[PDB]
Scaffold this active site. Structure first.
Site, PDB file in Angstrom:
ATOM      1  N   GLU A 213      61.565  20.342  47.332  1.00  0.00           N
ATOM      2  CA  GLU A 213      61.091  21.639  47.812  1.00  0.00           C
ATOM      3  C   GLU A 213      60.887  22.621  46.669  1.00  0.00           C
ATOM      4  O   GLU A 213      61.385  23.745  46.683  1.00  0.00           O
ATOM      5  CB  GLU A 213      62.056  22.194  48.850  1.00  0.00           C
ATOM      6  N   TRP A 214      60.136  22.174  45.670  1.00  0.00           N
ATOM      7  CA  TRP A 214      59.605  23.018  44.598  1.00  0.00           C
ATOM      8  C   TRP A 214      60.775  23.655  43.846  1.00  0.00           C
ATOM      9  O   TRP A 214      61.690  22.927  43.430  1.00  0.00           O
ATOM     10  CB  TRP A 214      58.598  23.983  45.212  1.00  0.00           C
TER      11      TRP A 214
ATOM     12  N   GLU B  97      47.077  26.979  50.990  1.00  0.00           N
ATOM     13  CA  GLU B  97      47.746  28.220  50.621  1.00  0.00           C
ATOM     14  C   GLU B  97      47.274  28.771  49.284  1.00  0.00           C
ATOM     15  O   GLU B  97      48.034  28.747  48.309  1.00  0.00           O
ATOM     16  CB  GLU B  97      49.259  28.017  50.570  1.00  0.00           C
TER      17      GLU B  97
ATOM     18  N   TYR C  89      54.688  31.463  58.314  1.00  0.00           N
ATOM     19  CA  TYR C  89      56.134  31.290  58.329  1.00  0.00           C
ATOM     20  C   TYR C  89      56.880  32.485  58.898  1.00  0.00           C
ATOM     21  O   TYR C  89      57.749  32.312  59.759  1.00  0.00           O
ATOM     22  CB  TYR C  89      56.634  30.977  56.912  1.00  0.00           C
TER      23      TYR C  89
ATOM     24  N   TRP D  76      55.789  21.188  59.197  1.00  0.00           N
ATOM     25  CA  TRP D  76      56.359  20.937  57.880  1.00  0.00           C
ATOM     26  C   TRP D  76      57.868  20.789  58.020  1.00  0.00           C
ATOM     27  O   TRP D  76      58.527  21.673  58.575  1.00  0.00           O
ATOM     28  CB  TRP D  76      56.019  22.080  56.926  1.00  0.00           C
TER      29      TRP D  76
ATOM     30  N   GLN E 116      56.031  15.922  46.108  1.00  0.00           N
ATOM     31  CA  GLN E 116      57.312  16.053  46.788  1.00  0.00           C
ATOM     32  C   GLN E 116      57.969  14.705  47.036  1.00  0.00           C
ATOM     33  O   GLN E 116      59.196  14.587  46.939  1.00  0.00           O
ATOM     34  CB  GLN E 116      57.130  16.781  48.111  1.00  0.00           C
TER      35      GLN E 116
ATOM     36  N   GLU F 170      50.605  24.149  58.296  1.00  0.00           N
ATOM     37  CA  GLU F 170      51.935  24.083  57.706  1.00  0.00           C
ATOM     38  C   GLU F 170      52.825  25.149  58.327  1.00  0.00           C
ATOM     39  O   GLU F 170      52.484  26.335  58.300  1.00  0.00           O
ATOM     40  CB  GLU F 170      51.856  24.254  56.184  1.00  0.00           C
TER      41      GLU F 170
END
Lengths: 454, 454
Positions: B414-415, B163, B303, B407, B17, B361
């Protein structure tokens, strides 16, 4: 105060949503009854067979309008009640029911803004073709005339159609609404027939010097740019490609309203993608330009904006994408944003000649919970406040907006969502059919009472 | 004051990142570089070729951690920097870069919670198979050991994985993350290999009596019921069918952590649907039960919740539905809800024996706008407050939670979202690489400083 004289504040209902009585009094089922009877069409296997007993408790519903204090009540005369076939033989029982409803609406000083069609097409009319078959242009016509000549002395403003975008795309392209068709050419044909019927009704009213005001109601989705939201610089291809989808959502219906012709570039794009026929688009152009006549009013149904940033990685038939900006959302998943409506309130002013513009449907759905025999929805109230200001501040800035109708009156059969999504401002306990006036009902009552002058 | 002693408050970053320098110092490209180079993988054709120059400004980044005051800094030693091939020959330049980073992290009192893998797999490792090939279980192993033996004196808590749900499904089933694979059997194989590597590392640490603590980080989606939100009565089939999807999102990974086996219900369902092989699931069970060993710690990345009402009309391989409750959402489209995490914190307490549990995260993405050389994100602050309370109130109620990592540190790649979504609490102007401390950075700084003693 910005709302002008005669600013038609109101509430809107659909007959199939609240009526029920699908077989009573010789009345045939609607399109929604047949659509809902089939499996895979509604969540939890729902249908409007019983609904909220609007037929039997019509006195209670008119008391509800009286309590709400709406200057005008937007309701649809259920076509199937008055005509079980849809035409020809006319049922005096349904005629008497609607006569009683209309006279008790008039007796209390409520202006009937009769929507001649609010998705409640009789089933036999669907069997003969629905809104794709061009014959309906006459049937609707005569039906409307038979209503108009029956109620011209009491009903002064008539709405030809409600959301031809939703009738044609949600109802006939996405299939989430009745009758559940999924096609784009059929959707375009529905657009053609709806516009032809609207202009035919307008011409018939104008020829005979009937002292009524006739228009059409649309739902229009504004556009905002995430790139501008991002703070970056917009590229040319971004606008050039957002234009096509915006034409699908915005221009495709407003262009025939006043210009009398379809957007040519979208038709060419569909032909190049083999989604539509060039001979068909030319024939549609010829028919529209021969049959076009300028209407009296225009109706707008605004809910949310479509934040569109340019990309080719969706795979959809229009290579764009949608963005999910941070903010408040509803049970329907719609972003709550006032200013999008403002865009339309200016855009149609710039792009088309002067057409009077009405708002006929706007509200938010929330999962209501019974608490002390009452339900609470503060998010509905906030949504309504925001969209009230979005038009009040606008009409301060020289807007020709004519009226705003809040959706909806009582919690009722919200189409494919069944009874799970409740839009109405009155809680109806399905067990007892008791009527509880929500905080949103009180807020709308207060708004209408405070703003509208004497 | 419910957070216990040793509550490892921290911030997490991923190397790819922020690093860039994909070809410098003999370092080969990552999996993310090859994934991003291909078209149709990332919005706007972005890649981590340059990123935020974390290599050259590592002193600036460590000053950023010093300013943030995190007791522990969760970072991933980029596997490709240290091993350009991924194994064998080891690059002394990347080793020296990470030596300098680790020594200047230790110098300021920052505990290095080194995530041995945070999606930054070397490209050659992907060419030999990625996480599907069981050989990586050793490679990772030796890599980890070579890091562990190099930094056991300074790095005490090691995270095996970040993850596996996202590595295996977002990365290997949905394909939004690198390497962009879209398969479900490969996803199960990734689950198998990740768990085997975690337990192999745990066993090797235990055998040699290394004074370190080794665990694994999971991301788990709790469940809430819209039917209960609706106020209605839940049916048996509702729970019976929500169970399978909830197993896939939760049980497929939690069950092998302590029970050393797979959820047989889901394997049977996949076999009956021909999505997975019975012989393969039995072989997986045999291998897991042979190689299983109880770890020291568990990591949680929470999340949002998945509101699920029962129906067969979604079209997914699991006949359930997702609901959109009214409330605040982010640019990622995630519903903001504390209590879901709380639900999760109880489930693992009840469904499995006592294992210490870490959160590593959690954060929210918002479209930051440069204003006076600064960016503002109050929604990130509110999200963090809510998820702080969700665990503080929990640990008041006897929770085995050990630590929480926010995070992210600075806005970065961001991917699949590219640089459009900004998660970090520090604004980095991509043009100038200037560092501005957001209100969210200040809020996290204040929270860590106030809540932790002294």
């Amino acid at each position: 105060m910005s709302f002008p004289k005669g600013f038609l504040w109101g509430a809107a209902t659909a007959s199939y949503q609240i009526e029920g009585a699908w077989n009573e009094d010789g009345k045939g089922e609607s399109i929604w009854d047949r659509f809902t009877h089939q499996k895979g069409n509604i969540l939890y296997g729902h249908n409007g067979d019983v609904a909220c007993d609007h037929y039997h408790r019509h006195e209670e519903d008119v008391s509800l309008m009286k309590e709400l204090g709406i200057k005008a009540y937007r309701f649809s005369t259920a076509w199937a009640r008055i005509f079980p076939d849809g035409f020809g033989n006319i049922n005096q029982k349904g005629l008497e029911f609607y006569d009683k409803l209309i006279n008790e609406l008039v007796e209390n000083g409520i202006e009937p803004v009769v929507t001649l069609y609010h998705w409640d097409l009789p089933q036999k009319l669907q069997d003969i073709g629905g809104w794709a078959n061009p014959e309906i242009v006459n049937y609707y016509f005569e039906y409307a005339m038979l209503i108009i000549n029956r109620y011209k002395d009491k009903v002064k403003k008539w709405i030809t159609f409600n959301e031809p975008y939703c009738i044609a795309f949600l109802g006939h392209w996405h299939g989430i609404h009745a009758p559940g068709i999924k096609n784009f050419k059929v959707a375009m044909d529905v657009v053609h027939n709806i516009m032809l019927s609207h202009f035919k009704v307008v011409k018939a009213v104008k020829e005979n010097n009937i002292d009524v005001e006739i228009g059409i109601t649309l739902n229009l989705t504004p556009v905002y740019l995430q790139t501008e939201r991002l703070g970056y610089k917009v590229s040319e291809i971004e606008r050039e490609m957002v234009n096509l989808s915006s034409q699908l959502d915005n221009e495709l219906f407003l262009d025939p309203v006043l210009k009398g012709s379809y957007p040519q570039k979208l038709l060419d794009y569909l032909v190049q993608k083999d989604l539509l026929d060039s001979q068909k688009v030319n024939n549609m152009q010829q028919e529209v330009k021969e049959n076009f006549i300028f209407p009296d009013f225009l109706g707008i149904n605004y809910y949310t904006r479509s934040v569109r940033l340019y990309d080719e990685n969706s795979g959809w038939i229009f290579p764009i994408r949608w963005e999910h900006p941070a903010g408040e959302y509803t049970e329907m998943g719609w972003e709550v944003f006032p200013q999008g409506l403002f865009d339309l309130l200016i855009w149609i002013k710039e792009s088309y000649p002067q057409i009077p513009i009405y708002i006929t449907e706007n509200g938010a759905a929330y999962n209501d919970k019974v608490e002390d025999g009452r339900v609470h929805d503060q998010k509905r109230v906030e949504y309504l406040k925001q969209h009230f200001e979005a038009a009040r501040k606008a009409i301060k800035n020289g807007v020709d907006l004519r009226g705003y109708f809040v959706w909806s009156l009582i919690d009722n059969f919200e189409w494919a969502m069944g009874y799970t999504k409740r839009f109405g401002i009155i809680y109806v306990d399905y067990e007892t059919q008791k009527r509880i006036k929500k905080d949103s009902f009180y807020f709308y009552q207060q708004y209408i009472k405070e703003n509208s002058l004497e």
